[PDB]
Structure formats: C-alpha cells, structure tokens
Design a protein around this ligand. Structure first.
Ligand SMILES: Nc1ncnc2c1ncn2[C@@H]1O[C@H](COP(=O)(O)OP(=O)(O)O)[C@@H](O)[C@H]1O
Ligand SMILES: Nc1ncnc2c1ncn2[C@@H]1O[C@H](COP(=O)(O)OP(=O)(O)O)[C@@H](O)[C@H]1O
Ligand SMILES: Nc1ncnc2c1ncn2[C@@H]1O[C@H](COP(=O)(O)OP(=O)(O)O)[C@@H](O)[C@H]1O
Ligand SMILES: [Mg+2]
Ligand SMILES: [Mg+2]
Ligand SMILES: [Mg+2]
Lengths: 121, 40, 98, 93, 149, 373, 521, 197
C-alpha cells in the first residue's frame, strides 16, 4: 500500500542513522581541536595537496550526501562567516547534545520536553 | 427473489480505492496534533 | 463456496489436468501459494478435513472474519494479548453455551 | 475486556450473512429478523431459509448438523487467530 | 572368520538345521567362559554383534565400544592391562583393576568417568568448563604451557 | 509438588501455551516424578498427531508409537486384549536364506525336496517356539514377513514389525522386559506385562497404547493443536518446563521472580560503591545502573511508564520491601514472592557469568585479522 | 486485485466475468469446429501432425478429431473427455451431444447476461431433462418375437448408420454385410471376434465377407498345402527349446560322451513329446509359440500341417470358428476334443498369400476383408464399419428401437414446452432455452444439407403440435415425410445416454467460477 | 463395530469407472476386482463354489537360498523330468481334493497348470496380490494357507454368486462377488459420464 515510488524508514531507524552520521562527522575533525592537535590533508583527483585544520574548510571540501552532514557543514560555514573562530567546537557540542538526546528519546520520553529542557538550560 | 449481480470489477476497484485512502490517512496520521514531529 | 446455492470451482494442475470440486480442502491444497499465512490456512483446512471432514472453508471464513474484526480494535489502541484473551474467553463461553 | 467479546459476537454472525448473500436476499435485514424472532420467542432453531420454503424454523426443515465438529472448528479458529495475532515479524529473502 | 574368501558348503538337512544351533551354542560357551574369570566390563575396539551384546547383557557384562587407536592404549596403560588380538579369556596378570566405573552426564553431555581412588596411578584428565570455545582453547593452551614449563 | 507446579506455571507464563499453564503443570510434574532417579530426558516420548485442540492433549502412563507398515494379515487379528504378554524380540520372521555366503550343491531331487521341506519346518518350529512362550504381542525391529503375520492371525495374536530402537527401549523400560535376540530362551522373566491394550483412531492415524503399568518409569506425550509451527512451539515449551522442573528437583533452591532480584543487586552494588574510592566507583556504578534494564524492558513491552515504575521500585528498595517486583495486570508494583512467582536461582547466576565472560572476551579483542577465502 | 502478492510468479486467476467469458468462447469454438460434420451431407476433415511420424488421417467422427486435436481450454478438455466416454460407451453419437452442449452453454450465456440466477437455470434444465426422459420412454417400439420385422429394423438401422459417413455409395452391400456378420455372433457381445483385415488394392466394390476364416500366416517347409477333411487342434506349449524347468539344473560332467548322451536324451524326449502330440490322431497342428527345425521336420515327415506365430486373439478366433479347445500336457486324448473342417487351401489376395479355412461347423467368429486405394479411405471405412457393428450390437441388446431423423428431439421439445406452459416463476426461461437448443439440431442438419431450415423446422413443429408426432425430415429431396415409410430408425439407449451426458456437462459447466491455474512446468 | 465405537476406512473399497449413468450407483455386500479369468473357456457365472485363497504360485517349489542342481547322467535328467510332472499332478489333485471349486492365487500361472485346471473344471483369478485377498478373506470368512498341503476343508470361504460383468464396447472385464454371509467390508461402485464426476 501507499505508492510513494521511493524509499522510507520508520521512526527510530532514521534517528539512529542521524545520530551515527553526526558522530562520524564529529569524529572526522576530532583530532585538530585543542592546541596540541595536528593538521590533516585533502587530495583531489588531479593531485592537489590541501594541508589545513580549521575545520570549516575540511567540512566544505568533504562532499557528503547526508542531510545531517550538510546541516552541520552549513552551520559551521555560517559560524565561520559570522565570527571565524570556533567552527569545530560548536559542531562537537551539537553532536554530543544529539547523542545525549538520543538516549532520552530511547527511554520513552517525548522530544518536546527534551527540547524545552535544552532551551531552559 | 432477484437482483442478481454479475460484475465484480467495480467492487474490486472501490475496495482498492478505499484501501489506498486508508493507507494515505494512516501515513499522514503522524503529523497531527500539538505533540507531533516533522518529516523529512 | 458456502451453502446450497454456491457454485463449484475449477483448478489446473502443473501438467494440465482439470479438477472440479467443492470440498474446500482440495481447492486450497492445489492453490500453490507463497505467503506463509496462506500456507498456514491451507494446513489448517487440511487438518480440519482430516479430523472432522465436514466444513473445510467455514473455519477459515470464521478466522478471516475474526481477524477483520480484530483489525479495528488493533487500529483503535488495544494490545493484541488482551484481544486474544478476550477472544479465547468468548470462544470458551460459546462452547459452554452450545 | 468487553470490546473483544463484542467483536467475537459480531464476527460470529458471518455465516448467516454469507448464506443470505449466496441465496439472493438482504443479509442484514434477514439477520436482524432472525435475531428478533429468536429474542422474542423461546426456540433456538430459526435459521436462514435458503431453499425458499416459507417457514424459517429449522426443526421441521430436517436440517441436522454436528456439535463436536462445530466446537472443534471454533476452537481451531480461535487458536489460529491467537497465533496470528502473536506473529509480528518476517525475514524472507 | 577367515581372512581368505571362503563360503560354507551344506548338503543334507541336518547341517542346515544344526549350523545356527551350533553357532549359538559356541557363542554362549565363549561368553560364559569369558565372564567366568570375573570380568565386570569389556572394552572392545571394533564392531559389535547383536547376539554377543544379548549374551553379555544376559550375564550382566558392560560393553564399551570406542575406536581411536590411541584412547584404547591410554586406557590400557592407565588401568595396567594388555590388549588381546583374539577372543580368549585373559590371565590374572592381564586384568584391569579399577575403582568405580559409572555413566553420568555434565553440561548435557553423556560421558564415561573412570575415576580411581588411588592417589598415584598413571595419567589424569583435566575437565574444563566454560561458555565459549575460544576461552576453552585459551585455557587448554595455558595448561599446555604450564606443563611445558 | 506445589513448588514444582508454581515453577512450571512461572516458566510457562511468557510462552504460547500461557492460557493453559495450569493444565500442563501437573502433567510435567507427573512426568518428571516418574523418571527413575538419574532423570533420563531421552525416556520421555513426544508425539505429534495432526488434529485436535489444546484440551484434547492427554498424558499416558506407558508407551505409544505410530502404526508401522502392515501386510495382508493385519485386519484378521483382534486389536484388543485384556491381560496379554508382550515379547520383545529382534529376529526377522520371514522366508529368506540362512546366510549370504552360503552355497547348496544338491545332487538329486530327494535332497532338494528335503531342504525345501526343512526350510518350512524350521520356520514353523521358530513360530511355535515364539508362540509357546505364552505371548500375545510380538514386537521386533526387523520387518516381519507375510507368512508370520498370517500364522499369528489364525491364533488370535497381535504382531507388529519395523519398531524403532527408541520406541522399543521405551516399551521395555515401561513394561519391564529385555531385548531377546534368539528365540531359544523365551522364559517368563523376559516377557512384558500390561493392564490394557487398544488401538483407536486419533486424527486419522492408527496408534497403539500400553497403559496400566505400575512399575513404569517413562511416559509418552500426545501434543495436539496446529500443524507444524504450533506443535514445534508446544514441544519447545514442554522441554523448557521439563528442564525447569528437573533443575528445581536437583537444586531445590528458587528465589522470587520478576525484577526484584535485579533491583536488590543493583541497590547492593550502588551501596557498596560508596566505599572504594578512585576510578573503581564509576565502573561499579555503571554496572549497577545497567542491571536495571530487566524491569524497564518488562514494563516497556506492555506500553507502561517504565520511568515511574523504576523510580517507585528504587524508592521501595531504598526504604527497606525486598522481593518487590513489577505487575502487568495491576499496572503497578507488588510482592512477587507472594504472587506465586518463583524462578530457579542458578539460572540468574549462569546468565550473569555468561554475560561477564562475553563482555570480557569482547573487551579483550584488540586487533582483528581477516584472511581471504 | 489486492496489492499484497499471494500467488507465486507465473500463475493467473480469472474471477467470474473473464472465466465465464473464456469458457463460453472455448465452448462456442469447440461446437463450431465440429458443426460442419453433423448432417448426413457432411464432409471430411484433415488431421495432419508434425511431432510424430508425419501421420495423415481423414475421418468423419467427432470424438476422433477432438482426441487428435489436443485442446488446452479447461472446458474443452472436459468436453473431449465426455466425448471419449460417450464413444467408449456406445460410440455412435458424439457430434450431436457436443453440439447440444454447445447450444445449451450458448443459451446459458445469454441467460446469465439477462440477470438470472444459475440455480434457477439448473433447476429448469433438470426439470426439462426429466420431462424429456419421461416422454421418450413412452415413444418406443418393442420388438423381439417377430424375427421378420426385427431383421428389417436391423437392416434399416445399419443403413441409417452407414449413410452418415463415406459408405453412402456402397451402403447397398455394406449394410447386408454387417447384418450377416452380426447374426454370426449368436447373441454374443464379444466384438473382438470380428477381425478386420485392410489391404491396398481394389476399391470398395471388391469388399466382401468370408463365410469361413482367413489367416495371414505361413506354414512350414516340406508340408502339404491343401488338406481335405482335416482336424484342427489348438495347443499351448513350448516346442522351441523345451526348458520350462525353473530349477538350477546344470551339466557338471567331465567328458564329452556324457554331454553327447544328454543331448541324445533331450532329442529323444522331444521326439516322444512330438509323438504324444500326434497321438490324438490329428493332421493339422497349431501352436502359439515358435517352431524350430526338429519339430518342423518331425511334423512334416508325417504329413501334419504346422502353423506358427499365433497370439491369443487368433487362437480365440480359431476356437470360436472351429470348436476345439486350447489343450496342453497331452496325456488324456479323450478330454481334449478337436474341430471340424473339410476345406483348407491357400488363396492369393493382391500380392500376399493367406490361408483359407472353409467348411466350418459352428462359426461364431468371422473376418472382413477391406479394400481401398488410400490409407485414409481404408481407415475411414474401418471406423465406419466398427461404429456400425457397435450400434448394431447395442440395438440388438436393447431389443427396442426408436424412430430417428429428428422426431425424438421434436417430441422432447414439445414435452418441455408443455411442461413450461404450466409453471410460472423464472424456470420457464431455462426450459425455453433447452427446447431451443433441442430444436436447433434439425436446423443445423437442414443448413448443412442445403435447404430452408427455418421453414422446415416450423412445419415440423406445427405438425408435431397438431398431431403428426411421427414425421421427420426428407433428405433425398427436402420435404416433410413420415419416418415409418422411408426407413429411418435410430435407437433409444444411445439417445438417452446422449441426453444424459449433455445435461450433466451443462450442469457441470454452468457452475464454474474462479479458474485458478498453477505454474506450468 | 459398536463394541469399540470405531470404524475402519480401509475395509470400505471405493472404486469408480467411466461410462454409464449417475443413478447406477448401488451397494455391493462383497468384493469386486479389476481382473478376469485365467482361461477364456472357463465358466463365467457359478451358483455354488468355495473360495480357496492361496499365496504360493503355481510353480514348482524353489528355495530363496543359493542352490545348484548337478546332472551328470541321463538317469538324473529323467528323474527330474518325471518328478516335475509328478509334483504337478500331486498339487493339482491336492487343489481338487480340498473340495473347493474356485481357487485364488497371487502370482502368475503357467500352461500345463492352466490346462489341468480347465480340464478339472476350476476357475481361478490371477494377479490379486493387493488388498483384494484380505477383503475376500474378511468378507467370505475363509482362511489363508501358505502352501497346498495345509489346504483343508475348514479353511474355505463360502461364495454365493461369482460372475463377471461387461461394460460397453471396451475390453475391460471386472469380477464381482455377491450373496455372501455376515461380511464386515462392502464396496461402493461409482458410475458416471465424466472424469471429475
Ligand atoms: N438444507 C440446508 N438448510 C440450511 N442450511 C444449510 C443447508 N444446506 C447447507 N446449509 C448450510 O450451508 C453451509 C455450507 O455447507 P456445505 O457447502 O454443504 O459444506 P461446507 O460447510 O464445507 O461449505 C453449512 O454451514 C450449512 O449450515
Ligand atoms: N508471571 C510473571 N510474573 C513476573 N515476572 C515474570 C512472569 N513471567 C515471566 N516473568 C519475567 O519475564 C522474564 C523472561 O522470562 P522467560 O520469557 O520465561 O525467559 P527469558 O528470560 O529467556 O525470556 C523473566 O526474567 C521473569 O522474571
Ligand atoms: N438417411 C438419413 N435420414 C434422415 N436423417 C439422418 C439420416 N442419416 C443421418 N441422419 C441424422 O443425422 C444425425 C447425425 O447422424 P450421425 O452422423 O450418424 O451421428 P453423429 O452426428 O453423432 O456422427 C442423426 O441425428 C440423424 O437423425
Ligand atoms: Mg581557534
Ligand atoms: Mg460440508
Ligand atoms: Mg453417427
């Protein structure tokens, strides 16, 4: 039934996929946060070395087909355009908040109360 | 004592339409009420 | 295929044989399905025909009607365990009353 | 638990409705008339006149069935319904 | 039987009627002569028969069948007995004195325990208990390393 | 017996036969109680006959097996005896050669006819030696020919061949006979004895019954219901109940079921974590918090507020109020020790040890090396 | 259809409209394929094949064509099975019953299209069939005591049966031949005693019936050809290597002299057996197995005719013609008996030599030699002769005849109309449809003949309603004449079985729904 | 079987054949078979005959073991040839001396045996190794003997009417037995014009 001509999920599978994608995006740039972190490297198809570790450039030159990944990338881009510093810490904090809220959602708790508590905090 | 029916295609078509409408209503039933979520 | 006014059915074998009957169990045994639930109904009809012998499609009709009636209660918001318990209690009451 | 008993009672009347449909008369009207005639008098032998004989009494129409067979049918149908209502998963290739 | 391919030749009816009788009589005599020495359990290393098993169960003789070409020698060295290539009654010096031979089960597995009440003896057997094959293999390897040390 | 019935009803609570848990409890109790002393699980026969409901399942006090392949002289013998004598044999009763490695070199027709007559003479002598033992029922593993079947039908005797090994062993353990290979030693102490022997039609299949044995140490279960999956689930539930009763007999130590033991263990681990300092407190706290997943999953299966129930259970455990678990029908909490909910205590210990071993083995894994093919 | 898949891949299912439409289309096609060969002036068809050995046959029977076509429609398969059962029963009316069934199904199609319950149609058809079977028994002529009239009735029946095929040109002789061959059975229903030998040479005018018996076998070497006043003795033994002993006897000697003595003893035993065979005082030996060289010369040295290669059919035919029994053992010549024959010779028919047996005593069996130019014509003639013999045996065992030509169908239609004109309800439509389907057969016959069908049918109906309940249809000119004056006579049991089979097939196909087809292999 | 409150579906033989009418279905209190006589000249119908059920074929005895017959002279061959016919005549006289008029075997026959049976006036039915022998032994009440020496007068079944029936123009003949005693097995004959009917 329900001819949609495509693919769909259920309820918790999409949330788990989004949480995993956010965790992967956070772990991608989790080695160049503090002052003791090292730099990365980005190579294309023709052979162009790109040594950088600002976070925003790495997220822009990543090309990921995930909605949460694109949301995090555009958020980091907006943070870099409005300020310029602290482009990875905000993404890490957002990923940690999503991971913490996933455990509350899995505990039979309505997301509205969690959102209200997060806003109050 | 009469009123015999020898057609079954309209009945099956109506049943399929009712089933499709019920499936659509069940699919759109999530986004309803003040405690509803958003779809992507 | 229920009642004296019901007509007969015709089935085609794998080779090309023609079989016309109205016993119910024989019609379901040569239906060739692949949905598990249909195979379960066929096995139930075969067991009923082997035990009693009369009324092979009435039991599956009653089962389908009961499932259709329980679909509404499941869509409303009732646990399936409570529905099964109520159905078992009603069946026991009907058996004791008959 | 009163909602399951009503559903079982409503689903149990699918045989007279099917008989009236296969005969060629109004199913719901005949079922309501039979129920009223059974609740007004004191004789549980009023069925559906499928052969169009006039009287609806099954005691004089020589309509004899089985008791253990019907009991086994009801028990098997209830068991199958309980078993189907328990299954809620499938893993087919 | 004989190693060379050979059949039996019968002509009259007396031989056809007495062959099975004499065979059963000889089998019963051999079973009685084997159990006359005082043996309580017979451990074989080949194929058993139905008549032999029935005659052993009639005289209350335990039969243990196993084929590994190493476990038999280990049991013979443990109980202090020698192997006989024929179905002849053994001598007093070729007997296997034990302590307790029973059949129990541990962990849903039937096993035959040959526990001896002697402090010394010959060899021993370490029984391992666990829930994973990898842990049991690691424990066995640790035991082997300890034995080597 | 009451404790065994309660344990069986508790073990058969989350199964498919939950509506008839009070009927199978006495059955499994009587089955385990009559299992000698070593508790032989292979002695219990589980038969599945198509047809019938759950209430039609009966438990016999003897042995029962399916009818094997018959011949032409099977409907000429009586199928009902009062006090017969069962003689379990193991030799073939048919016209065949003596040995496969034999050769007869006859001379004239005299010795030929002599051998032809002596074959039937030996056959009749064997049939008479089997009949001279005073038996009425003949059971053997080897198939029986038509000659012996026709000979036994003329003297009003029952016979059946192609008997399996397990069925023969069960019949021997129920009656009290022995497997006799030769027919030259058929005395009186090697013959079976029963109180009744009939053969009715159950589900369209012919079955035999050998009930009425006071010295029997086995039984046979007749499971009815669905067709295949229902019978398999019923057999699995029966085996689980039998194992639970066997464990309760071998250990005679049961505790309160539900989520009371886990809550008490979590409370004890949380109270013990307030003594050892360092990094050991966080691990013990996490281990205690992880033990509360049983009541949460038990309350979440019916759509109940697991958080409030867990908080109430924690408050009741801290204020005391030892065997306080959850409730499904009451939608609250109650004492599981008074609700006749008992479970074997060794099962929880085994599960905890297995979980700890699995966690240790998973944590110990560092580098995984894979090879092609 | 439900979106959830239930059946396997490669399995279709028709509900009520499509299934009934396909069944009616198949029934109409089956009825129209054979409708061309129904009337007396019908033609023949060609049934060629390519999967076998390029077999080409030309016949006029409907059952043979339906069996050789190999249909695939489920209703067509049921119709073919019914036609085969009818042919195996009496074998005389298959096209008629299949046309009646097709017409009944075509009428039921229009009745269902008019919003009519199938149960009412079934009840009306059953009542019409009961009325027809009740009115048909009252219109039957009983015979048996008068042999003069019985012979004329048998001749007329044989002529009417033969005039519906390719034997219309030689009906003046084939009818008499079949009548003479039927009377030779002495009331025995064994149709296997009549041997049909087809040869390629002459035309249909050269066919005749032998008063004795013929055999297509050869005799031994150095044996007398013609033997006058002989005594045929049928035997059943193994002369070719007499080793009937199933014992494990093996020669385990140590010298060639012993083997030579054993061979001489075997030869002496064979000679003694041959002498014991001829000890009955016979001169014409007949065996069922093969004859080697020693028994052949042993029989030829004494002047005894030996016949080889004889199956069970030939032995039974010889025993029925002569009178001897199948003897063996040869120990008591008194309890064996012999035959009777005074004329034995060999004739040449075309290019082959056959043994002629004349001067018989009893003569329960007989042979018929058929001559034709084409294999298809010979097969058609053989089939027509077999059908004529079958219908003659049937009308002899029935001992009652019924005027054919179309009078029985008109009487049944009139009875059905009279029964329907007295009862109300919706059952009057089924009886009217049955009467129309019954009256359509003379219409189809007249259309295949080449005359006005509607006018003749109306005139016959008016005559049957006004009183002329014995007239029919003249095929020699196209008018209305009495059936008792011309010579057209059918049967009663054949028509009754045809009507019963048609009614049963109609009632079975009328209640057909949900055609579930499985996956083809 | 009221003493045990059960029946047996294996005793009721349900057989059908094409051809005929639907109203020709009748009950037969005997045993019907799908075979004929061993000889076409044998009498078809009988009024008073006894059933002699046999299992061994009409062949000389042969053991199932490995036997070898050695013939080293003419005397041995002559003795074997004489003993063959001697045993044949002995078994033929033993079949007749039992008083029965219709013997029933199981396997095939031969030529000399069939000729002797035809000369001694005794019909027989061949190829009945299925449940037909058991049905006849249950209905007629006669016993079954493995050999010929045990064929006594007490182990014979009483037959009332044994006559074969002929159908249409086909070559199929079926033998039916009727007019029996208190039998416990009946046959149901189904006739029709279609295969699915
Ligand atoms: N003459 C009758 N009078 C009343 N009810 C009938 C009659 N015949 C059949 N029925 C009903 O029709 C139902 C179907 O019966 P039937 O089609 O014969 O077998 P099945 O129950 O296997 O479909 C039965 O439950 C019975 O109650
Ligand atoms: N009647 C009952 N009352 C309270 N708790 C129960 C009851 N029945 C089952 N449980 C709980 O459900 C849990 C699951 O038990 P069960 O389904 O029998 O085996 P498993 O633990 O393998 O799922 C058990 O830990 C038990 O405490
Ligand atoms: N000489 C004749 N005169 C009148 N009617 C005839 C004649 N020959 C055949 N018929 C009619 O033709 C019909 C078909 O006959 P026939 O061909 O023998 O049977 P079928 O059509 O079944 O092969 C019959 O019903 C018969 O009435
Ligand atoms: Mg910075
Ligand atoms: Mg029915
Ligand atoms: Mg014709």
């Amino acid at each position: 039934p329900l001819s949609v001509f495509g693919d769909r999920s259920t309820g918790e599978t999409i949330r788990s996929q989004n949480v995993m994608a956010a965790a992967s995006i956070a772990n991608i740039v989790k080695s160049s946060l503090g002052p003791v972190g090292l730099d990365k490297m980005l190579v294309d198809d023709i052979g162009d070395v790109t040594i950088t570790n600002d976070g925003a450039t790495i997220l822009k030159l990543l090309e990921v087909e995930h909605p949460a990944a694109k949301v995090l990338c555009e958020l980091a881009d907006l943070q870099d355009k409005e300020v310029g510093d602290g482009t990875t810490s905000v993404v890490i904090i957002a990923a940690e908040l999503l991971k913490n809220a996933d455990e509350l959602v899995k505990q039979k708790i309505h997301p509205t109360s969690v959102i209200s508590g997060y806003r109050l905090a | 004592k009469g009123a015999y029916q020898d057609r079954d295609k309209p009945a099956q078509i109506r049943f399929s339409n009712i089933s499709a409408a019920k499936a659509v209503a069940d699919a759109i039933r999530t986004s309803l009420g003040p405690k509803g979520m958003d779809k992507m | 295929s229920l009642g004296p006014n019901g007509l007969d059915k015709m089935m085609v074998d794998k080779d090309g044989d023609v079989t016309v009957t109205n016993d119910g169990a024989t019609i379901l045994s040569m239906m060739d399905v692949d949905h598990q639930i249909a195979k379960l109904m066929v096995e139930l009809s075969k067991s009923q025909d082997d035990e009693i012998g009369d009324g092979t499609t009435g039991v599956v009709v009653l089962a389908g009607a009961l499932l259709e009636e329980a679909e509404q209660l499941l869509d409303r918001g009732i646990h399936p365990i409570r529905i099964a318990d109520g159905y078992e209690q009603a069946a026991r009451v009907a058996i004791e009353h008959l | 638990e009163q909602y399951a008993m009503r559903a079982f009672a409503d689903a149990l009347e699918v045989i007279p409705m099917a008989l009236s449909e296969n005969s060629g008369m109004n199913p719901i009207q005949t079922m309501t008339e039979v129920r009223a005639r059974q609740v007004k008098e004191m004789n549980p032998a009023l069925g559906i006149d499928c052969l169009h004989k006039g009287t609806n009494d099954m005691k004089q129409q020589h309509v004899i069935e089985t008791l253990i067979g019907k009991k086994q049918q009801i028990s098997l149908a209830t068991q199958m319904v309980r078993m189907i209502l328990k299954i809620d998963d499938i893993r087919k290739p | 039987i004989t190693e060379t391919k050979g059949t039996v030749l019968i002509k009259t009816a007396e031989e056809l009627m007495n062959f099975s009788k004499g065979e059963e009589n000889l089998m019963d005599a051999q079973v009685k002569a084997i159990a006359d020495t005082g043996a309580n359990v017979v451990v074989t290393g080949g194929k058993v028969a139905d008549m032999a098993l029935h005659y052993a169960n009639k005289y209350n003789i335990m039969l243990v069948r196993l084929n590994s070409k190493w476990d038999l020698r280990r049991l013979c060295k443990t109980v202090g007995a020698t192997a006989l290539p024929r179905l002849t009654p053994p001598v007093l010096e070729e007997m296997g004195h034990c302590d307790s031979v029973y059949l129990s089960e541990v962990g849903d597995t039937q096993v035959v325990v040959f526990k001896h009440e002697k402090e010394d003896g010959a060899i021993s057997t370490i029984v391992l208990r666990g829930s994973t094959d990898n842990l049991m293999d690691d424990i066995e390897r640790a035991v082997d390393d300890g034995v080597n040390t | 017996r009451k404790l065994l019935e309660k344990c069986a009803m508790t073990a058969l609570s989350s199964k498919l036969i939950s509506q008839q848990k009070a009927f199978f409890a006495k059955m499994v109790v009587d089955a385990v109680m009559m299992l000698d002393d070593l508790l032989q699980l292979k002695m219990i026969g589980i038969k599945k006959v198509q047809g019938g409901a759950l209430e039609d399942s009966q438990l016999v006090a003897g042995v029962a097996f399916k009818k094997t392949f018959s011949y032409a002289g099977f409907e000429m013998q009586p199928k009902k005896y009062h006090n017969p004598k069962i003689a379990l044999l193991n030799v073939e009763l048919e016209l065949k050669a003596e040995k496969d490695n034999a050769e007869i070199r006859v001379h004239t027709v005299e010795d030929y006819q002599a051998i032809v007559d002596a074959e039937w003479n030996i056959l009749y002598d064997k049939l008479e030696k089997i009949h001279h033992s005073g038996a009425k029922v003949v059971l053997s593993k080897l198939p029986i020919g038509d000659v012996a079947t026709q000979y036994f039908a003329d003297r009003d005797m029952f016979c059946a061949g192609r008997v399996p090994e397990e069925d023969l062993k069960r019949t021997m353990m129920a009656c009290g006979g022995s497997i006799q290979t030769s027919v030259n030693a058929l005395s009186a102490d090697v013959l079976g004895r029963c109180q009744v022997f009939e053969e009715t039609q159950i589900g369209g299949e012919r079955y035999n019954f050998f009930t009425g044995c006071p010295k029997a140490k086995t039984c046979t279960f007749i499971l009815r219901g669905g067709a295949e999956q229902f019978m398999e689930e019923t057999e699995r539930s029966l085996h689980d109940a039998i194992m639970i009763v066997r464990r309760a007999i071998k250990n005679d130590s049961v505790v309160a079921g539900g989520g009371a033991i886990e809550m008490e263990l979590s409370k004890y681990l949380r109270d013990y974590s307030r003594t050892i300092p360092g990094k050991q407190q966080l691990l013990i706290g996490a281990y205690a918090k992880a033990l509360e997943i049983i009541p949460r999953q038990l309350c979440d299966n019916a759509g109940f507020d697991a958080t409030n129930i867990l908080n109430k259970l924690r408050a009741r455990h801290a204020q005391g109020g030892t065997w306080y678990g959850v409730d499904i029908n009451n939608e609250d909490i109650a004492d599981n020790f008074e609700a006749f909910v008992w479970e074997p205590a060794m099962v929880r210990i085994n599960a905890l040890t297995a979980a700890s071993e699995a966690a240790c083995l998973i944590v110990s894994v560092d580098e995984t090396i894979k090879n092609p093919r | 259809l439900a979106p959830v898949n239930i059946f396997k891949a490669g399995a279709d299912e028709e509900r009520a409209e499509t299934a009934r439409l396909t069944s009616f289309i198949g029934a109409i096609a089956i009825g129209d394929l054979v409708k061309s060969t129904l009337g007396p002036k019908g033609m023949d068809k060609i049934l060629l094949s390519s999967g076998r050995d390029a077999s080409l046959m030309v016949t006029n029977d409907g059952a043979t064509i339906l069996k050789n076509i190999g249909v695939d429609n489920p209703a067509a398969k049921v119709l073919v099975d019914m036609s085969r059962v009818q042919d195996d029963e009496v074998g005389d009316g298959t096209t008629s019953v299949t046309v009646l069934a097709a017409e009944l199904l075509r009428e039921a199609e229009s009745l269902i299209a008019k919003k009519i319950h199938p149960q009412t149609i079934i009840a009306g058809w059953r009542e019409a069939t009961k009325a027809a079977r009740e009115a048909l028994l009252s219109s039957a002529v009983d015979h048996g005591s008068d042999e003069v009239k019985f012979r004329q009735d048998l001749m007329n029946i044989a002529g009417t049966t033969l005039s519906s095929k390719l034997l219309t040109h030689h009906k003046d002789h084939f009818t008499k031949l079949a009548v003479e061959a039927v009377l030779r059975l002495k009331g025995s229903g064994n149709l296997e005693a009549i041997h049909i030998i087809k040869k390629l040479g002459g035309s249909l005018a050269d066919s005749y019936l032998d008063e004795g018996f013929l055999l297509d076998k050869k005799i031994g070497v150095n044996q007398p050809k013609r033997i006058e006043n002989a005594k045929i003795l049928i035997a059943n033994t193994g002369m070719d290597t007499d080793k009937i002993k199933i014992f494990g006897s093996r020669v385990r000697v140590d010298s060639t002299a012993k083997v030579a003595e054993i061979e001489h003893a075997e030869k002496e035993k064979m000679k003694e057996k041959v002498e014991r065979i001829l000890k009955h005082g016979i001169n014409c030996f007949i065996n069922r197995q093969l004859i080697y060289n020693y028994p052949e010369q042993l029989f030829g040295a004494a002047g005894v005719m030996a016949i080889e290669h004889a199956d069970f059919a030939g032995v039974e035919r010889l025993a029925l013609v002569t009178g001897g029994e199948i003897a063996s053992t040869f120990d008591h010549p008194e309890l064996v008996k012999l035959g009777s024959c005074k004329l034995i010779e060999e004739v040449m028919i075309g290019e082959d030599k056959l043994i002629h047996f004349s001067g018989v005593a009893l003569g329960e069996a007989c042979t018929i030699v058929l001559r034709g130019a084409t294999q298809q014509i010979l097969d058609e003639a053989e089939r027509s002769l077999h059908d004529a013999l079958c219908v003659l045996a049937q009308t002899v065992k029935d001992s009652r005849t019924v005027y054919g030509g179309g009078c029985s169908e008109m009487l049944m239609a009139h009875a059905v109309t009279q029964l329907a004109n007295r009862t109300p309800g919706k059952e009057a439509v089924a009886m009217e449809s049955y009467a129309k389907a019954l009256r359509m057969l003379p219409t189809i016959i007249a259309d295949n003949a080449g005359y006005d069908s509607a006018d003749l049918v109306a005139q016959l109906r008016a005559a049957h309603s006004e009183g002329n309940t014995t007239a029919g249809l003249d095929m020699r000119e196209g008018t209305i004449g009495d059936m008792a004056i011309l010579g057209i006579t059918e049967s009663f049991q054949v028509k009754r079985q045809v009507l019963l089979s048609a009614a049963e097939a109609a009632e079975v196909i009328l209640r057909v729904d949900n055609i579930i087809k499985a996956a083809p292999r | 079987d009221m003493e045990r409150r059960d029946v047996d579906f294996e005793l009721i033989k349900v057989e059908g054949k094409v051809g005929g009418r639907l109203e020709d279905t009748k009950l037969i209190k005997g045993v019907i078979v799908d075979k004929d006589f061993s000889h076409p000249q044998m009498p078809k119908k009988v009024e008073d005959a006894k059933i002699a059920i046999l299992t061994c074929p009409f062949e000389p005895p042969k053991p199932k073991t490995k036997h070898k017959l050695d013939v080293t002279s003419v005397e041995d061959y002559k003795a074997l040839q004489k003993y063959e016919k001697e045993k044949f005549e002995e078994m033929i006289q033993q079949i007749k001396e039992t008083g029965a008029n219709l013997a029933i075997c199981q396997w095939g026959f031969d030529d000399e045996a069939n000729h002797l049976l035809l000369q001694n006036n005794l019909p027989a039915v061949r190829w009945v190794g299925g449940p037909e022998i058991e049905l006849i032994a249950i209905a007629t009440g006669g016993r079954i003997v493995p050999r010929f020496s045990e064929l006594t007068a007490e182990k014979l079944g009483f037959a009332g009417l044994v006559q074969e029936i002929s159908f249409g123009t086909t070559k199929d003949k079926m033998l039916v037995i009727e007019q029996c005693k208190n039998s416990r097995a009946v046959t149901i004959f189904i006739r029709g014009g279609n295969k699915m009917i």
